[PDB]
Amino acid sequence: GAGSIREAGGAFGKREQAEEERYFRAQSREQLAAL
Amino acid sequence: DLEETGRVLSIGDGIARVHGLRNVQAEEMVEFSSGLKGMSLNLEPDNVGVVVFGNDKLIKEGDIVKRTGAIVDVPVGEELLGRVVDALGNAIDGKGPIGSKTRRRVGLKAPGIIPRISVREPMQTGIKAVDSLVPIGRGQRELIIGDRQTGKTSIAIDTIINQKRFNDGSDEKKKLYCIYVAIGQKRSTVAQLVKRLTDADAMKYTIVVSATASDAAPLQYLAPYSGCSMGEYFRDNGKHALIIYDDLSKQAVAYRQMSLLLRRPPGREAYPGDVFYLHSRLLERAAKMNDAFGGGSLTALPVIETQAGDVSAYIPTNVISITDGQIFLETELFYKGIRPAINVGLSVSRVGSAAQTRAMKQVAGTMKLELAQYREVADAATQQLLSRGVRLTELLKQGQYSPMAIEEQVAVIYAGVRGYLDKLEPSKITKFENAFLSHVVSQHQALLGTIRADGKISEQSDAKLKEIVTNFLAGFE
Amino acid sequence: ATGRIVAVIGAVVDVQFDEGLPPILNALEVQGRETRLVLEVAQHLGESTVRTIAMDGTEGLVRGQKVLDSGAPIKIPVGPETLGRIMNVIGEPIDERGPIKTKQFAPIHAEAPEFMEMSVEQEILVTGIKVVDLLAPYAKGGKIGLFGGAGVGKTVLIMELINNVAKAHGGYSVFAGVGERTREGNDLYHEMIESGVINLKDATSKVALVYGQMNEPPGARARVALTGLTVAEYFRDQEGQDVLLFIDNIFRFTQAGSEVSALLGRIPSAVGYQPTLATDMGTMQERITTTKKGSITSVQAIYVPADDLTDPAPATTFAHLDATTVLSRAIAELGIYPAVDPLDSTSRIMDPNIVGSEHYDVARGVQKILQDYKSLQDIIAILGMDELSEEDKLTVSRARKIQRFLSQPFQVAEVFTGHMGKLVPLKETIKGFQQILAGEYDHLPEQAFYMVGPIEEAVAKADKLA
Amino acid sequence: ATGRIVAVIGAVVDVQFDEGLPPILNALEVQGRETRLVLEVAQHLGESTVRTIAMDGTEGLVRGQKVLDSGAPIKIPVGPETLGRIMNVIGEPIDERGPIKTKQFAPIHAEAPEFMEMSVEQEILVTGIKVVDLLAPYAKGGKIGLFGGAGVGKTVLIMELINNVAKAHGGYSVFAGVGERTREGNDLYHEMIESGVINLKDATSKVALVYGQMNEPPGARARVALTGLTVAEYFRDQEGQDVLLFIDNIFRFTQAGSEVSALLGRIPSAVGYQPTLATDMGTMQERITTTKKGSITSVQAIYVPADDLTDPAPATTFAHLDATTVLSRAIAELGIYPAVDPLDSTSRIMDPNIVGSEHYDVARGVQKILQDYKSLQDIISEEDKLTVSRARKIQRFLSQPFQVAEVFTGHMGKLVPLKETIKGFQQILAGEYDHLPEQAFYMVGPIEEAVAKADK
Amino acid sequence: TLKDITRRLKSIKNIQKITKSMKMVAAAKYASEQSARMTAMDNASKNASEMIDKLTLTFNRTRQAVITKELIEIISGAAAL
Ligand SMILES: Nc1ncnc2c1ncn2[C@@H]1O[C@H](COP(=O)(O)OP(=O)(O)OP(=O)(O)O)[C@@H](O)[C@H]1O
Ligand SMILES: Nc1ncnc2c1ncn2[C@@H]1O[C@H](COP(=O)(O)OP(=O)(O)O)[C@@H](O)[C@H]1O
Ligand SMILES: [Mg+2]
Ligand SMILES: [Mg+2]
């Protein structure tokens, strides 16, 4: 049952997605500035 | 002569197709050549479908079916007290035949609106938790619902044994004749139950109707109605009866077997559409009559077994919709030693409050409120609520086969609710309860007799109670 | 016309006619019975045989027994003479007070009112119940439905509504007890006698009672709702009166139809129900309506089997109602009574142009905060309360205060709760909930809002706890 | 009465009789076959036709082939001559050791004992196994659910129960292989031969075997439990013994009944089980009881479908169970044998009014200390270390060497009486052996053997 | 619906395993905030186990209902021929 927290689309699957996008939108801004 | 006599066409699936019997009535008892009896279920243009009350092994194609001319009825009367009968009224205790003078149809409709009156007088179970928090009145239908092995039959047996203190006295008003209907139980369990009632001398006012697990499904279907007719006898002749259906889950399973073998459309959990009517027409017959109809009553304590505590299932919710309240028994409590494992937040008695005596009311209103607070909390005040609630929950525990008189319960709950037990530690509550109860029984029969005759606690009796409990708590471990 | 019984299977009886086959829905009288056994023609089977549904027990019926055709459907007495009386499914008196001497009789099977008779006016009906008046208000002349499983408070709520609306009502009232407890009918009868709404001595009675209860065979349970309908329809049409019709329980109509459909020879539908569930329900429900000849405010308790709202019977009833009060067992286990689910109860007059922008905004804000709490429930359950924002904690606290303040003590519930009942005006409800939503009571504990009337009683209870 | 086949649809055969229709549950004999084919009457269809279920395969059956009425239900040889033998559902030997030469035969369909033949108070059946007798005792004439399958010593416990009831009570055993794998049936036969429970050379055999294989039609698998129960009924009613009856498996008995009911065209109930599930289970289980002559105690292996205990088959079986023995692999990998889980095994007669206050209190104390020790393990104080020590010693002292394992392990087997068990655990709980090492209790009988092992 | 219940069971089983591992990791790193995290993850695992038990009951109930419903559909289709 891997990735079954996000696949169930609950309050935890939305919390996970919000984290991945927040962390990687900050990384992409820090990676495009240098780029 | 194919008008009062037929020949079996087919047999199997518990239904015998009979050719002939042209003058047979619907729902009439027929008699097979083997000695078995049946009921005319389907009158059809070319045959009669007969529900066999017994094993299909005994009925062959070509056997003769004679009609008895009577719609299905059972022997009723006082002559059944102390006897163990099967679903048809035949004695299975080997004590000879029943000498009954009266028979009564098993499918009679419950009384109407006018013959009834509100439930007013108490049905004492002798169980502190029931008699104080979930009081039952005469004429009520109170459901005992819970998982397997949670103590339901024990509640019923304690009630039956408790009725001895009233059935031995001279108050004919306050007597209660009991009927125990075993449906789908083990036969050895019913034998041990009948011995428990014989030891406690509770059989002389009890009828036991036995349709056990090896009996054909039509017998387990018929047993509750036979027992209810035996009770309606008392209800209609000015007396009071209590009937336990143990349990209606297995009766619904027997009826589902019969219905699926008749190829009827299954519904929720493969149950037929009329599985609600099956129990509703039965539990409606438990009624309190007004005085123009004799003033008698019939109280029903149906039992229902849930699966993993699910009380929102089909049959549990049906019976909850039929009855006047329920006594929930939880497994999580029963394992923790809280016995009777009565859930007080979920059990209710809709019409029993008006039946509770005044003394029990005086102590039980306070007990119920304190328990509600203890539930709603679990500093320096909430800690006192928790302590009082814990002491009360140990005060509600009780043993088996030892029901208590109402005055003794009043004394114990009094000691609990005024706050004397707040000194002791919880593990000593049962010790104090038993010792104090023995003390009050031995040296204070006058105060208990006054409370019992008065039905309430006068300020005189309240003062005497405070004195006795302070002295005992002073001189106690 | 006279026929003879050829088959008896439960409540279903086949009758074969030599001459004069009776129409469908005609009432037939069985000869040779102690009491009146009425058969209602349901189907024409062919070969001059009809299939009927018995309105009473069929025990003792013999094949070949004679049956007379009445020439018309079941006709009950209608009029002002039925007020204060109790009649059964076939219009016979069951209160031991003699014959109901009306001057007309109406068949219990009638056509629904046409499209050009419908009435569109939607004035509110204040009930004094905070959750009902706030979130799903009832309308005068509308159809109210109270959904709920076993033991959640449909009868308590409908008795509270009888107490809060029917006594204050200016017109007549009809209570149809359909497949419920007989002792509840006895209780209602005697309560109405003491409260004066039924008068046994003169003609000032304001309620007519029709009872076919759960001890009745399925034919009586299937037609007693129609009998009550007929009484209410007479009051609405020939009197032009405003009528109050209480039906408890209307699910038993469908359940009895299912029980007889088993034997009428029909292929079962979903969950074993009759294939005609929706059209039977529609034929019955369309007669319970306000026309432009008179008004019928209708309150119906709908049983929900095994707490499944998706069951065909409640799911079909949902479309026939203007206001639905959905009681929840989960809410009843939290001690909140009435157990109304605030995010499952709806009303059609919950419209700013009908209830005003203040009422509408307060209701919508309450529902918003309750939905937000429900969304947070999982995180609150696993990761505890402390892993939330401060705004989420504020939302949770306000939502819990609002949950408590939606509860209310009823006057019919005093006997087993001890708290005196409360009848909260609509102004006080809107004000209290506006104030809680504003935060004016974020300092009081949530347990102060539990089981109170107006918000002033909430602040008094808070002052008495501290 | 002679009939003729009118229809063959799978394992269902319709037989028409031109005179003397046989009652229901009668066995019929199909004529002209190289192996015995038996049909059991299920229904009377009308027009002198009965519908039957076959006990063997129906291939090669011809419409019109003659069928003989036996005149009774399936009759099997019952007697002491069935001990050590294997018979199938219709009572013929399947071990190739010759005919079973009993003097009488009994029909496999019988009514349960009447009401007045029942024992009115429950007594304990002492097995000589410490953990069973103490924590989850067996009742005479009761039904015991045996949980746990392979790798937990189920067969060793079965054979030890056979041996111990033969020694302590003098009562024989019957093993019914309901839906048995033929490989595991051969394995069981040979483990019983090597442990002395079955003796192929003299009449000292202690168990009778009845095998209904997995490759037999559902009727045979639905009646093999009745065949075994009939052998046990003989041993109880004619010799007044306390008989053991093993039903492995009971879920397969339910499954075969469901398959037979589906073959007969009956509408399935909830989850697909026969509509007669409770009554089939009841008519079987009610014959397992204590009468005035003797008793039949039944150990029954429970399989739970989908680990769902509310499934209709377990839920119907659990209504008859008086006890429960859970064989846990977490106990076996821990080194304890028998691998009985002492906290999950239950009993209905673990009640002071039945087993006595002393027994109840010792058992309760043992269970409470074991639960406390599980709690303390979960966190790994002052006396909690002493609770840990006493609970380790109790865990070890629940073990026991079996006699049926003597040839393989070398250790002598121990049949501990009830009083010695009660007092040994009572003494360990009081602290009378807080000095002895914890491995002085591992694999011993009475507590005296523990102190004797502590000496060395 | 059976698939919704299976999704939720799988999700909460994963949450329970993760919080148990986090409790062990905090128990190692604690050998005042580490103690709080250890107890908090212990409580989260306990609550997740209770939700898992209730959902397993609901799942078994729903799968029994689904089997019964499909059987009834097949039976009613066969009885109409
Ligand atoms: N108040 C009690 N105090 C102590 N023990 C009790 C109490 N009630 C029941 N027990 C014990 O729990 C056991 C099970 O109780 P009981 O048989 O009455 O409940 P049940 O629900 O009817 O069980 P079943 O499902 O087999 O019918 C009893 O044998 C009894 O030993
Ligand atoms: N408004 C209420 N306040 C307190 N308790 C209530 C209320 N409504 C219902 N209950 C509880 O539910 C019980 C039965 O409710 P009931 O009116 O019989 O509903 P139903 O007809 O659906 O079974 C009551 O006896 C009471 O315990
Ligand atoms: Mg019981
Ligand atoms: Mg109701």
Short mmCIF file of C-alpha atoms in Angstrom, two decimals, chain B residues 35-217:
data_model
loop_
_atom_site.label_atom_id
_atom_site.label_comp_id
_atom_site.label_asym_id
_atom_site.label_seq_id
_atom_site.Cartn_x
_atom_site.Cartn_y
_atom_site.Cartn_z
CA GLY B 35 -48.11 -37.62 14.32
CA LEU B 36 -46.63 -34.31 13.20
CA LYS B 37 -48.63 -31.11 12.93
CA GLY B 38 -48.61 -28.39 10.33
CA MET B 39 -50.18 -25.07 9.44
CA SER B 40 -52.08 -24.30 6.25
CA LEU B 41 -50.09 -21.42 4.76
CA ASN B 42 -50.99 -21.19 1.06
CA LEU B 43 -54.50 -22.15 0.01
CA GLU B 44 -54.15 -22.59 -3.73
CA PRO B 45 -56.60 -23.65 -6.46
CA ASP B 46 -55.05 -27.12 -6.66
CA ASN B 47 -53.08 -27.69 -3.43
CA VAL B 48 -52.40 -26.54 0.12
CA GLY B 49 -48.93 -25.47 1.20
CA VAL B 50 -48.42 -26.66 4.75
CA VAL B 51 -45.71 -25.41 7.12
CA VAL B 52 -44.49 -28.54 8.92
CA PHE B 53 -43.89 -28.18 12.67
CA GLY B 54 -41.15 -30.78 12.82
CA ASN B 55 -38.82 -32.73 10.58
CA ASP B 56 -39.59 -33.34 6.91
CA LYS B 57 -38.04 -36.79 7.35
CA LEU B 58 -41.26 -37.99 8.99
CA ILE B 59 -43.55 -36.98 6.10
CA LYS B 60 -43.64 -38.88 2.81
CA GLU B 61 -45.38 -38.37 -0.50
CA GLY B 62 -48.78 -40.00 -0.26
CA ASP B 63 -49.25 -39.55 3.48
CA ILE B 64 -52.69 -38.64 4.80
CA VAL B 65 -53.28 -35.13 6.17
CA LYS B 66 -56.37 -34.65 8.32
CA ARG B 67 -57.55 -31.22 9.37
CA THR B 68 -58.20 -30.45 13.03
CA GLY B 69 -60.63 -27.62 12.28
CA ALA B 70 -58.80 -25.22 14.62
CA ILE B 71 -56.66 -22.24 13.73
CA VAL B 72 -53.23 -22.78 15.30
CA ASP B 73 -53.56 -22.47 19.07
CA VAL B 74 -51.70 -23.51 22.21
CA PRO B 75 -52.86 -24.63 25.66
CA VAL B 76 -52.93 -21.75 28.13
CA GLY B 77 -53.65 -21.35 31.82
CA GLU B 78 -52.19 -21.73 35.28
CA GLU B 79 -51.51 -25.42 34.59
CA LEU B 80 -48.42 -24.49 32.55
CA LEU B 81 -46.61 -22.89 35.49
CA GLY B 82 -43.56 -24.94 36.40
CA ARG B 83 -43.65 -26.83 33.10
CA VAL B 84 -41.21 -26.92 30.20
CA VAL B 85 -43.08 -27.17 26.91
CA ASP B 86 -42.10 -27.02 23.27
CA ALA B 87 -43.42 -24.48 20.76
CA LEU B 88 -46.70 -26.41 20.38
CA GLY B 89 -47.47 -26.68 24.09
CA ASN B 90 -46.40 -30.30 24.51
CA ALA B 91 -44.58 -30.96 27.78
CA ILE B 92 -40.94 -31.98 27.30
CA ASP B 93 -40.01 -32.28 30.99
CA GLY B 94 -41.45 -35.78 31.41
CA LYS B 95 -43.79 -34.66 34.21
CA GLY B 96 -46.86 -35.88 32.33
CA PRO B 97 -49.40 -33.98 30.24
CA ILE B 98 -50.59 -30.41 30.70
CA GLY B 99 -54.02 -30.29 32.28
CA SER B 100 -55.12 -27.12 30.51
CA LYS B 101 -58.79 -26.22 30.08
CA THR B 102 -58.32 -23.34 27.63
CA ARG B 103 -56.61 -22.94 24.26
CA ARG B 104 -55.66 -19.66 22.61
CA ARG B 105 -54.70 -18.79 19.05
CA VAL B 106 -51.06 -17.86 18.59
CA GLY B 107 -51.72 -15.21 15.95
CA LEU B 108 -54.26 -13.04 17.73
CA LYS B 109 -53.95 -9.33 17.01
CA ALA B 110 -52.66 -7.06 19.76
CA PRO B 111 -55.17 -4.91 21.67
CA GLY B 112 -56.24 -1.62 20.16
CA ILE B 113 -55.80 1.92 21.44
CA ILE B 114 -58.81 2.01 23.77
CA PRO B 115 -58.11 -1.17 25.83
CA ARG B 116 -54.74 0.26 26.87
CA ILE B 117 -53.58 2.62 29.58
CA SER B 118 -50.22 4.16 30.35
CA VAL B 119 -47.57 2.09 32.10
CA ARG B 120 -47.71 3.14 35.73
CA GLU B 121 -46.59 0.33 38.03
CA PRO B 122 -43.03 -0.97 38.30
CA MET B 123 -41.58 -4.23 37.03
CA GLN B 124 -38.69 -4.84 39.42
CA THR B 125 -35.67 -6.61 37.96
CA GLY B 126 -33.60 -6.52 41.15
CA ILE B 127 -30.62 -5.24 39.16
CA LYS B 128 -29.35 -1.92 40.49
CA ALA B 129 -28.34 -0.50 37.11
CA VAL B 130 -31.66 -1.43 35.50
CA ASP B 131 -33.96 -0.64 38.43
CA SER B 132 -32.26 2.73 39.01
CA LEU B 133 -31.22 4.04 35.58
CA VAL B 134 -33.34 2.08 33.08
CA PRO B 135 -36.56 1.42 35.03
CA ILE B 136 -39.05 -0.97 33.43
CA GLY B 137 -42.79 -0.78 33.97
CA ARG B 138 -45.49 -3.42 33.61
CA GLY B 139 -46.75 -3.44 30.05
CA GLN B 140 -43.49 -2.16 28.59
CA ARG B 141 -41.34 -3.68 25.85
CA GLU B 142 -37.70 -3.28 26.86
CA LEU B 143 -35.06 -4.69 24.52
CA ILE B 144 -31.90 -6.37 25.84
CA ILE B 145 -29.36 -5.94 23.05
CA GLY B 146 -25.67 -6.74 22.96
CA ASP B 147 -22.94 -8.93 21.56
CA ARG B 148 -22.57 -12.62 22.32
CA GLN B 149 -21.66 -13.47 25.92
CA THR B 150 -22.32 -10.03 27.40
CA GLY B 151 -24.82 -11.06 30.07
CA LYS B 152 -28.27 -10.75 28.46
CA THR B 153 -29.75 -14.07 29.56
CA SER B 154 -28.33 -13.29 33.01
CA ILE B 155 -30.39 -10.10 33.19
CA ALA B 156 -33.51 -12.02 32.20
CA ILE B 157 -32.84 -14.81 34.71
CA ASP B 158 -32.17 -12.32 37.51
CA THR B 159 -35.52 -10.69 36.75
CA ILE B 160 -37.35 -14.03 36.88
CA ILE B 161 -35.65 -15.00 40.14
CA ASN B 162 -36.35 -11.51 41.56
CA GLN B 163 -40.11 -11.99 41.11
CA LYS B 164 -40.09 -14.53 43.98
CA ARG B 165 -40.33 -11.86 46.70
CA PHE B 166 -43.66 -10.75 45.22
CA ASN B 167 -45.02 -14.15 44.19
CA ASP B 168 -44.68 -15.56 47.73
CA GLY B 169 -46.54 -12.72 49.46
CA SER B 170 -50.23 -11.99 49.84
CA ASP B 171 -50.33 -8.97 47.50
CA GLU B 172 -52.07 -10.49 44.47
CA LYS B 173 -51.73 -7.11 42.76
CA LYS B 174 -47.94 -7.27 42.86
CA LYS B 175 -47.39 -10.81 41.56
CA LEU B 176 -45.75 -11.48 38.19
CA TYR B 177 -45.85 -14.78 36.31
CA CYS B 178 -42.88 -15.29 34.03
CA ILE B 179 -42.53 -16.91 30.62
CA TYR B 180 -39.12 -17.77 29.18
CA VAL B 181 -39.02 -18.53 25.46
CA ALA B 182 -35.80 -20.16 24.30
CA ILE B 183 -35.36 -19.79 20.53
CA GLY B 184 -32.41 -21.43 18.83
CA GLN B 185 -30.42 -21.93 22.02
CA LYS B 186 -28.51 -25.04 22.97
CA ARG B 187 -30.72 -27.60 24.68
CA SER B 188 -28.17 -28.08 27.46
CA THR B 189 -28.20 -24.33 28.13
CA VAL B 190 -31.98 -24.46 28.57
CA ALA B 191 -31.67 -27.48 30.87
CA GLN B 192 -29.12 -25.65 33.03
CA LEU B 193 -31.36 -22.56 33.02
CA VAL B 194 -34.33 -24.62 34.19
CA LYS B 195 -32.16 -26.03 36.96
CA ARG B 196 -31.10 -22.52 37.99
CA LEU B 197 -34.77 -21.57 38.19
CA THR B 198 -35.58 -24.73 40.15
CA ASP B 199 -32.87 -24.08 42.74
CA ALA B 200 -34.02 -20.50 43.29
CA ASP B 201 -37.58 -21.88 43.54
CA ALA B 202 -38.52 -19.68 40.57
CA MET B 203 -40.06 -22.42 38.42
CA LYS B 204 -43.38 -22.54 40.29
CA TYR B 205 -44.33 -19.25 38.61
CA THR B 206 -42.46 -19.68 35.31
CA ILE B 207 -43.30 -21.28 31.97
CA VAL B 208 -40.40 -22.24 29.72
CA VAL B 209 -41.05 -22.62 26.00
CA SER B 210 -38.19 -24.42 24.26
CA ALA B 211 -37.45 -24.34 20.53
CA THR B 212 -33.75 -25.11 20.48
CA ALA B 213 -31.07 -25.24 17.80
CA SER B 214 -31.91 -28.77 16.61
CA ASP B 215 -35.63 -28.03 16.22
CA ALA B 216 -37.05 -27.32 12.79
CA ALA B 217 -37.15 -23.69 11.74
#
